Amino acid sequence: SGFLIPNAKYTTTNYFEFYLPYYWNIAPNMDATITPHYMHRRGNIMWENEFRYLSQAGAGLMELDYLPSDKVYEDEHPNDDSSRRWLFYWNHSGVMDQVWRFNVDYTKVSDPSYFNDFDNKYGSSTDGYATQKFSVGYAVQNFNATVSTKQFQVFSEQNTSSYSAEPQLDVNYYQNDVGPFDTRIYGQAVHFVNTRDDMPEATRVHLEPTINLPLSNNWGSINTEAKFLATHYQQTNLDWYNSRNTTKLDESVNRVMPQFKVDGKMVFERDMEMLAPGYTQTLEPRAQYLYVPYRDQSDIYNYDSSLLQSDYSGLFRDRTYGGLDRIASANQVTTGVTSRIYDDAAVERFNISVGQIYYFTESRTGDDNITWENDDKTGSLVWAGDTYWRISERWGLRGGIQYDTRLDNVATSNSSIEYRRDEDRLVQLNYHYASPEYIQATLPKYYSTAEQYKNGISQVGAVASRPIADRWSIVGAYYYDTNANKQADSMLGVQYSSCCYAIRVGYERKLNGWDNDKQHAVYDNAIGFNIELGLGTQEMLRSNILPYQNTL
Amino acid sequence: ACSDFMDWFYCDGYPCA
Amino acid sequence: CGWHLRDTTQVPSTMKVMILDSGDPNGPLSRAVRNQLRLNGVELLDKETTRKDVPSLRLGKVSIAKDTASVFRNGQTAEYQMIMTVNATVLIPGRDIYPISAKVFRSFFDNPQMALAKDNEQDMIVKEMYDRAAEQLIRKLPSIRAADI
Ligand SMILES: CCCCCCCCCCCCO[C@@H]1O[C@H](CO)[C@@H](O[C@H]2O[C@H](CO)[C@@H](O)[C@H](O)[C@H]2O)[C@H](O)[C@H]1O
Ligand SMILES: CCCCCCCCCCCCO[C@@H]1O[C@H](CO)[C@@H](O[C@H]2O[C@H](CO)[C@@H](O)[C@H](O)[C@H]2O)[C@H](O)[C@H]1O
Ligand SMILES: CCCCCCCCCCCCO[C@@H]1O[C@H](CO)[C@@H](O[C@H]2O[C@H](CO)[C@@H](O)[C@H](O)[C@H]2O)[C@H](O)[C@H]1O
Ligand SMILES: *CC(=O)N1CN(C(=O)C*)CN(C(=O)C*)C1
């Protein structure tokens, strides 16, 4: 337990930065770290406290940052009472006795602009909100019951109204081999409150018995499932919403509705003769009929239901919204095909998937307020495709595309090819796309008119690593937005590694917010060095706002 | 030539440049 | 067309009766793996049974990471990339130990205005990813039997 090596940093938001860490070894399972962090532009010392613990209930980490005063914050906010800033973070995860599951993921900040000014170690400038989750669960082989609390601190000043389930109870019971059938029951009891005192408040009780008949075979499988959904809503505090909205919420709502699903899959095999002998090609057709009757749901406020993306895996999902507030009617057939290549050692070398969703009738909910480019309602509307080619042991290439005829354009698309000789030696290119029509359809209304969200996403990223003489490691990253033709993030890192010490120097320039007065992005630069007592390539590659991900 | 063409970007040895 | 229906089982015949071992037997990954093994006709024995001439499948570390795939024009996150990595081991008794792995990718847009709803979506994504990590593990079983020969 003693002083560490003080590292230094220069940033455009804080100017010269200084850290003076002190490590306190409390016990074999507990330790703490007290770091005075001098900031010159803000002209004070922020005190940072790490506390790492290991216990019977699991492993946990606590962080407390406190800055008593802030010249910059008081200058920007002269009318506030105090300029103190602070962060509280708590992350606990554990399983005790193999049956008790304890989870805590709590973040609280003093102001929404905390992560735009401070080190992004347990948060980020790319985060739009802070999560505050508690969870205690009991799980055995055929039953589980979880009590959880969920809260969110929204950073955006456009609308901070966020709903939270203060109690939430989840109970799952499983009973296999009930004759030829497999049975399950899912129960939930949730209470939705809101930060604003005029928005509706609710309590919801959900029950879901499901029974399925699976029939397997060497070459095919057929699964039939009958599900029943019973929801009771008791919502109060509706004078405001009923006063200014034409559609009226009801205090008591009962939503009872069946669901029928039939999934089928086939496997065909052939020996690849034209290509190198010994390779086997598998063609995997898959079909799914889904029926869910239409029930009017305009009288239930949407608390936790959002649209779900339709990749190839998501085409066969039986739900089109998350949560339980919105359950769209469905009369659908989903068809997909997956092709796989196998070498002589029976290792999957290549797979490609394509699928579509055909709607026999319009999927309705009674509150269909989604902005669609055209008025397509029935037919083959959603298409998805995936590909993953392992070109060699060092090359890899994944790609994915989503098409929606209602958007009349490709919704989302991603691709990436990586070369990875090893952890110190790799190169990767990636591309991410999201059309403006899809942003208009799925995101809030003001996204379609805001200059920093309306154009969608068109991002090209390049990452590279280069070690020198088994003592130096140079890592670089560059991300470019092609719609605006401008940088989003750049990173450089040089680490000299020796037997007893390692010296790391880093540089990053990132998008760090928006300026509405002139309507343009605000960039941030940071050059820092730290000394420690591997070549650290992976740690350097994780240090930017768009961290590196392995792709093989 | 070489089995791996990415050696030209990182191989060390003798850089011959 | 040279195609034909798959006459061979998805799981090899030697691995038809096997032991499922893990440090978190009640976890979601163990449940998904047991379920997928149950579809394939695999007879799962208790780890403490006296029958020692059966292969063992020991689930290892599970890692889930959520990062920012892309950002908007103001630096806010747009796409969240969730990545699941699962490491497992297959003990062929008296023969060898074979490591296997399964890595799964998913993505979804962020929406602070309905952040709670997005949180529910995230949970659903995790509930799918374990299943995607289950099918990948049994799909690598034929490679182990091929490698064993
Ligand atoms: C993608 C397009 C859709 C593809 C879907 C195609 C349908 C699914 C094909 C797989 C069919 C599974 O059907 C399989 O049939 C055999 C022989 O009848 C059943 O076999 C078993 O039950 C039958 C009675 O049905 C009895 O003779 C006996 O108990 C046993 O043989 C299996 O329990 C079932 O798994
Ligand atoms: C069948 C399986 C498929 C596996 C994956 C195959 C696709 C892999 C990823 C493809 C990546 C390229 O992604 C592609 O990006 C271009 C470039 O803007 C998008 O193009 C979009 O914008 C451009 C200009 O900005 C417009 O001219 C175009 O009409 C519009 O679609 C495409 O809509 C998208 O499909
Ligand atoms: C930037 C946009 C373009 C991105 C794409 C760039 C090219 C991507 C493909 C490169 C891979 C093919 O290039 C080369 O192919 C050969 C032929 O099997 C394989 O090469 C392999 O050869 C033998 C095995 O056959 C091994 O001893 C060797 O170590 C290995 O490299 C690898 O796959 C790659 O070395
Ligand atoms: C892979 C290969 O062909 N080479 C040839 N070299 C030169 O042309 C200088 C030697 N070399 C390295 O130094 C890495 C590799």
Offer a quick outline of the entry.
Chain A is mostly beta strands and 552 residues long.
Topology readout:
The complex is a heterotrimer of chains A (552), B (17) and C (149).
Chain A: E1 2-3, E2 8-11, E3 15-19, E4 22-27, E5 30-39, E6 44-55, E7 58-67, H1 71-76, E8 85-96, E9 100-109, E10 129-140, E11 143-154, E12 163-178, E13 181-194, E14 201-215, E15 220-236, H2 239-244, E16 252-266, E17 268-272, E18 279-292, H3 312-315, E19 330-342, E20 348-359, E21 379-389, E22 395-404, E23 409-422, E24 425-434, H4 436-442, E25 457-468, E26 472-481, E27 486-497, E28 502-515, E29 520-532, H5 537-541
Antiparallel strand pairs in A: 1-4, 2-3, 2-29, 3-5, 4-5, 5-6, 6-7, 7-8, 8-9, 9-10, 10-11, 11-12, 12-13, 13-14, 14-15, 15-16, 16-18, 17-18, 18-19, 19-20, 20-21, 21-22, 22-23, 23-24, 24-25, 25-26, 26-27, 27-28, 28-29
Chain B: no helix or strand
Chain C: E1 4-5, E2 17-22, H1 28-39, E3 43-45, E4 56-71, E5 77-92, E6 96-109, H2 115-139, H3 141-148
Parallel strand pairs in C: 2-3, 2-4
Antiparallel strand pairs in C: 4-5, 5-6
Helix pairs in contact in C: 1-2
One dodecyl-beta-D-maltoside is lined by residues 352, 354, 385-387, 399-401, 409-410, 413, 415, 431, 433, 458 of chain A.
The first-level CATH class of chain C is given as: Alpha Beta
- Give the helices and strands of chain C as they follow along the chain: EEHEEEEHH
Number of helices of chain C: 3
Helix proportion of chain B: under 10%
Helix content of chain C: 25-40%
Family (chain A): Belongs to the LptD family.
Organism (chain A): Shigella flexneri
Keywords (chain A): Cell outer membrane, Disulfide bond, Membrane, Signal
Subcellular location (chain A): Cell outer membrane
Task: Fill in the keyword field for this structure.
heterotrimer, A: 552 residues, mainly beta, 26-stranded antiparallel beta barrel, 5 helices, 58% strand, C: 149 residues, alpha/beta, Double Stranded RNA Binding Domain, five-stranded mixed β-sheet, 6 strands, 30% helix, binds dodecyl-beta-D-maltoside, binds the ligand *CC(=O)N1CN(C(=O)C*)CN(C(=O)C*)C1
Could you please describe the fold and organization of this structure?
It is classed as membrane protein. The complex is a heterotrimer of chains A (552), B (17) and C (149). Chain A is 5% helix and 58% strand. By secondary structure, chain A is mainly β. Chain A is built from five helices and 29 strands. Chain A has helices at residues 71-76, 239-244, 312-315, 436-442, 537-541, and strands at residues 2-3, 8-11, 15-19, 22-27, 30-39, 44-55, 58-67, 85-96, 100-109, 129-140, 143-154, 163-178, 181-194, 201-215, 220-236, 252-266, 268-272, 279-292, 330-342, 348-359, 379-389, 395-404, 409-422, 425-434, 457-468, 472-481, 486-497, 502-515, 520-532. The longest helix of chain A is centred in the C-terminal third of the chain and has 7 residues, at 436-442. Chain B is largely without helices or strands and 17 residues long. Chain B contains no helices and no strands. The radius of gyration of chain B is 8 Å and the shape is elongated. By secondary structure, chain C is α/β, with parallel strands linked by helices. Chain C has a five-stranded mixed beta sheet, with helices on one face. In chain C, strand 5 and strand 6 form a beta hairpin. Chain C is elongated and about 60 Å long. Classes of the chains: A mainly beta (552), B little secondary structure (17), C alpha/beta (149). The interface between A and C is large, with 89 and 62 residues.
